[PDB]
Every structure is written in C-alpha cells, then in structure tokens.
Amino acid sequence: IVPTRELENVFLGRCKDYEITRYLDILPRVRSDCSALWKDFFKAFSFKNPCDLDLGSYKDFFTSAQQQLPKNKVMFWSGVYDEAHDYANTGRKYITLEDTLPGYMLNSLVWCGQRANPGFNEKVCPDFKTCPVQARESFWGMASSSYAHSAEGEVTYMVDGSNPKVPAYRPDSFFGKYELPNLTNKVTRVKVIVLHRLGEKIIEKCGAGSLLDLEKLVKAKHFAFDCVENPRAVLFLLCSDNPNARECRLA
Amino acid sequence: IVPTRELENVFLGRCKDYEITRYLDILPRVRSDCSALWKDFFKAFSFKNPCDLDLGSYKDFFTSAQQQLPKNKVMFWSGVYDEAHDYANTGRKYITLEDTLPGYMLNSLVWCGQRANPGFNEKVCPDFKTCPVQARESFWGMASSSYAHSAEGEVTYMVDGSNPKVPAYRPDSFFGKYELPNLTNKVTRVKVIVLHRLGEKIIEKCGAGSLLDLEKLVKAKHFAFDCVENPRAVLFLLCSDNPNARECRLA
Numbered sequence: 184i185v186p187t188r189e190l191e192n193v194f195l196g197r198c199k200d201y202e203i204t205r206y207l208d209i210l211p212r213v214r215s216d217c218s219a220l221w222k223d224f225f226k227a228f229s230f231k232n233p234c235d236l237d238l239g240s241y242k243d244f245f246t247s248a249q250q251q252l253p254k255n256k257v258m259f260w261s262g263v264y265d266e267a268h269d270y271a272n273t274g275r276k277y278i279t280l281e282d283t284l285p286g287y288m289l290n291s292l293v294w295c296g297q298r299a300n301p302g303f304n305e306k307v308c309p310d311f312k313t314c315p316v317q318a319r320e321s322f323w324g325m326a327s328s329s330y331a332h333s334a335e336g337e338v339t340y341m342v343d344g345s346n347p348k349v350p351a352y353r354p355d356s357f358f359g360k361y362e363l364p365n366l367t368n369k370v371t372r373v374k375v376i377v378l379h380r381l382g383e384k385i386i387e388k389c390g391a392g393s394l395l396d397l398e399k400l401v402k403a404k405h406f407a408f409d410c411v412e413n414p415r416a417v418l419f420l421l422c423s424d425n426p427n428a429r430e431c432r433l434a
Numbered sequence: 435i436v437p438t439r440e441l442e443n444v445f446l447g448r449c450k451d452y453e454i455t456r457y458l459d460i461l462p463r464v465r466s467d468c469s470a471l472w473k474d475f476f477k478a479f480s481f482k483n484p485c486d487l488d489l490g491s492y493k494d495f496f497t498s499a500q501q502q503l504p505k506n507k508v509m510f511w512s513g514v515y516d517e518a519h520d521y522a523n524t525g526r527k528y529i530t531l532e533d534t535l536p537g538y539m540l541n542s543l544v545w546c547g548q549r550a551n552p553g554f555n556e557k558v559c560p561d562f563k564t565c566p567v568q569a570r571e572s573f574w575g576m577a578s579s580s581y582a583h584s585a586e587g588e589v590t591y592m593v594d595g596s597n598p599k600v601p602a603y604r605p606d607s608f609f610g611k612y613e614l615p616n617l618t619n620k621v622t623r624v625k626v627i628v629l630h631r632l633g634e635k636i637i638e639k640c641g642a643g644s645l646l647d648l649e650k651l652v653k654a655k656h657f658a659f660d661c662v663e664n665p666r667a668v669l670f671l672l673c674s675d676n677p678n679a680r681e682c683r684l685a
Binding site: 187188189192193195196197198199200203204270272291292415416417419420422423424426427431432433434 | 438439440443444446447448449450451454455520521542543666667668670671673674675677678682683684685
C-alpha cells in the first residue's frame, strides 16, 4: 500500500488546526504540544520492521493524546462509516473516535516503520495482511481502547444489519475486542442502532442472533441495553441519499 | 473581537492538510506552495487599517489560490449555511466555497491588520461593524467573486424561504453582489432550491416575490432557470433533525 506523503507535516498541520480551531465547544484541549505528540507517535513505530508492533506500541502517544469525553455522547460504529459519521454530525449529536484529537490526526493516513534510517518507509507499507493481528491493529486498537475507557453515561453503537457475510456484532471486531471490554462502571447503558440499508435484505434484527449475544454481554457488565432498527433520525438520512427508496414513502 | 491565535501556523497547517489529504479526487491541487500562499495573504492585509481594505486587497492571493471547479457542481447559498453544507456533503454532492482551498483555510478564522509592527494584531481586533462595507466584505466578497467566476455548467443556489424579515433573493447579499454578477457564459442554468424550515410559516415561493425578481435577472443574463421548494432529498435531510414534524410523516 502507498504511504501518506509528508507524514510529519500532515500530522503537525492537523494537530495545530485541531488545537486552535476544532471541536472547541465539545472536546477539551490536551496538555501536550504538537511536537511532543509527534515524538510519542513516531517512537511507537520508527526504526523497527513494519510488523514489529503490538497493543502497547503507541501507549505513550495515546496517554498523552487522550481527552475527557462528553457524557452520553460517545458513539462506536462497525461496518457503517459514512452513516455513523453522517448521523453523529462532527460532534454535534455524537462524538466518534475520528472527532477526537488522535483519530482526527491519523484518520485515512498510511504509515509504517523500517529499521534503516530515516526509520519509516516513504515508498511502501505492507499489505498488513502480511503482519500478525496484534501489529495490524496496534494503532487503531489502542485508539479504540483508550477512547472506550474514557466513555461515560450512555454510549451508542451503530452496526450493519444488512451484511450477509458479517454479523452485526462480532467478538473480533474493534468494538468486540477493544471497546466493549474497556467500558467502565462510568457507562450506564449501551444503545444499539441497527442500520437496515435501503433496498437490501434484512440480515440481523434486535433481540435475535448476534444482537442477542451482545445484549447478554452488555447486561453481564451491569449496563442497561436497548436496541432500535432504522430509528427515524437515521432513516431520514438514508432517504436523503436515496429519496425514491420504498422505505421513504411519505403519507 | 478576539482574533485567531497563531494565524500563520493555523493557515499553514490547514494548507498542508488540504494539499495532501482533502478533496483529492474532487478538486485539483493548487500550484503555489503553502508558504507562497501565506506570503500573498499576509501582504494583502498587513500594515493596513482594517477599515481601509477593499475588493482589490486580496485579489492577488485569490488569483494564486483559485482552483478550476467541477462542471455542474458549484453551489451558492443564502441564509441556510448549515443545511446547504450538509446537503453538499463535503464535496461529494456539490462543492461550496468552504471546500475550496482558500475557503477551507480561512473558514471561521478572525484576523486584522494594523499599521504598527508587526502589521497585524493577534490579541485584539476592532469590531469590524465600524468599517465601510467594502472593507467588511473585502475577503469573503473577493472569495465569492473568484469562486463564482470559476463556475461552469449548472449552478445551484439554496435559499431560506421561511424568513419574513429577509427575502430569499436580495440584490445586496453576497449572491446578488458578488456571485450572480460574476457567472460567465460557461454557466448554463441557475437551479434554485428554496428551503421551507419545518414547522415555520412559508414565506417565499418559486415564481413569486423576490424569487420572480431573481428569475427575471437570470433569464436576462441568458441562463436557464428552475426552482423547487423542499425537494425530497432536502426535505429528508431537514426531517432527520426533527423527525416528529408534521411535514415528515411517512406512510
């Protein structure tokens, strides 16, 4: 895969932009300056083979970059990027990982280390399917773990209930592996939103299948649980992008 | 008013973030380096009293920063910033001025030049209401003119049709002063979308009032014209934020 060009400049530009101008009324600023954050980020993977990472590699970076998160507003999502982010709406209704400082800085970027100077590979990064799972998931797994650990109150989880090949809830997704296990006693309820894509066959429904498994896990952690399928607010967003869908017929 | 801190750092950071990662398959890259754009921008307003700026102050900066725009995709807006930008969807459905490089770099920032060293103030600025209109609109007016001048194909204009105090089309708005007068013969049609806010009294309607005045102006410039009120895709977007509104009842 192709690494992002000028990684340091993009990281530092996004960091400064975020610092001074983004999410000012939703997320607090962190204590560390952008250069200190770059040093913590770079040392996690630099001067090592591209697959020499595990869940602790970016530990310092994430500790330094973690923000306190707004109560009742944290959202997790699996297999529904556009829909979840369109619904959260850049932190106005819910916050997603990609709205936090670390998620904003590295979203969509590609990078990897190498042992030879300059310590990172500017020409090519592995198909990651070539790296073991703990390495492949080193950054985003730790991002998701730190994010979930800071969640408070009600949390929302949006999932795809229309994918015949991937259940709505799975223990090996980032949510199953890194977020649910790190929700603390500060969380009080897991609110699931099941997206039923317009025009496609419904695969998963609340109260059945993997959603029933999720419900049991949530309750075992003493949290409340609720689940809804295409709640109106979400359905209207789907309809805005496909207004002639049968599901969008008006009275 | 309190200006944006570290203006050069924020500008340069947004410029590099844009260059390497934003709108990559939607808008072309600009040839000038971010440092060259900062020099142009800073030369436009520094060492000048804010009240002395005019439409030509930022003309050379906009010449350096202007991108060719995708045919049929340009959108103009009046009174409906949030709805227009949500519908345009970060360049995927329509382009707005805020998706272009200059628009993205200066969006929401506040700055002011001064005559004493260092030629601008990063701690305090005079309220700009005291300045003449050509100085108050120096930057965004020139931005709007340059952007409209680059439009080709069909252009869309979304307006507020539910404000009894502000007509949907006004000769003195940015659209009437800077955009409509700058559309070239590469533009073929002006498509008007009238937004009727949910739960509010309908004020303006296509073919009547200020919208008929606009229709006449458009036709006089030999562009085709069409107008719709709350087309389905826009209605659904409004409904996502107020799903229980009478106008949003589904079958």
